[PDB]
């Protein structure tokens, strides 16, 4: 096999990344977000009551209109760090680039408003490994795998800045394969701790001269459905006090104006330094001393087994295009362009 197939993406305010899959025969079109931090596929159902204003505001899933749909009706309970989602198991032909693939996916039918009424996207395709899987469903690109039609066994992201032009490519996976447009030089792999969770180990994180953080090593899940960079509270809070940043109900903030002279943050990886900018981690809406800026950076307690652990999210994965490597278990970064 030689193939490998790109999906756009849309980028929306530089949070949510989602490009479109198509399922079912004629293909039903669907928003989703590629995640690494998971393993199932879902999509919100026909049979999601009203009552679920976030089914409302959604396309949704009819196995009616499907010839190639096969029931299966399996209970399905998926619970991210947003919330809870629940339907039931079914299967079908997915497209995701060239690529199509008889898949197993939940039908989503209880959707909380909190924070779906916000999302973007429809639904979540996992990209993490089957021993994440709830139900231990086989994942989609384990599938994929098995067809045999890949060129090599990795998939990457390249996530852009959000632009007003409205021809910016906001960003974009390639199954298969790594496209050398949107990056530059070789990659740099770093080998996952272990198969089964996109997570490395990671040296320390320095905020500015000193290494504050994570001094004596700690760990770094991969994540391309994270919108920010996440640590654990005691460590985000070293570090917003080490950045004089303030904590609200939502976010993290920074008088605009301080922002462009605020410290860089580097994360240590396979022997070396992947830094951001405070370019890179502000959200500079105005560079006013009477305005308040957003950092892409939040507390996450992840609970064991995969935490405690920090997250690499977009903000990271904006300034280091990021290739996920099945067949050698690794994780690639090269500088995005
Ligand atoms: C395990 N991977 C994801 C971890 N994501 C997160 O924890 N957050 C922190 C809370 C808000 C989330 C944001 O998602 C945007 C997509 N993501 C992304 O475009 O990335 C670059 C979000 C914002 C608004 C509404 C909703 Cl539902 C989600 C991001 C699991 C996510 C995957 C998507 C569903 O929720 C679970
Ligand atoms: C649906 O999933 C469960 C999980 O494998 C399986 O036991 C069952 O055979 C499948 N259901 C049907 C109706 O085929
Ligand atoms: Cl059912
Ligand atoms: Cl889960
Ligand atoms: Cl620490
Ligand atoms: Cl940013």
Redesign the pocket.
Known sequence: GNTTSSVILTNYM?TQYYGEIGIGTPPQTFKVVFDTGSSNVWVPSSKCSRLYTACVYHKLFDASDSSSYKHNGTELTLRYSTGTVSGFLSQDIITVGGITVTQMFGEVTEMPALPFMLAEFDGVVGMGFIEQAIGRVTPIFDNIISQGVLKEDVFSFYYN?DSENSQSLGGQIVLGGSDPQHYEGNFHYINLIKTGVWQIQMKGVSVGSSTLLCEDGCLALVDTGASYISGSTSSIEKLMEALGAKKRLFDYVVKCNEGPTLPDISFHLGGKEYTLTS?????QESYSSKKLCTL?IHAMDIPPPTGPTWALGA?FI?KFYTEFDRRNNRIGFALAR
């Open positions: 530089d800045r370019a890179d981690y502000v959200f892409a903000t904006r």
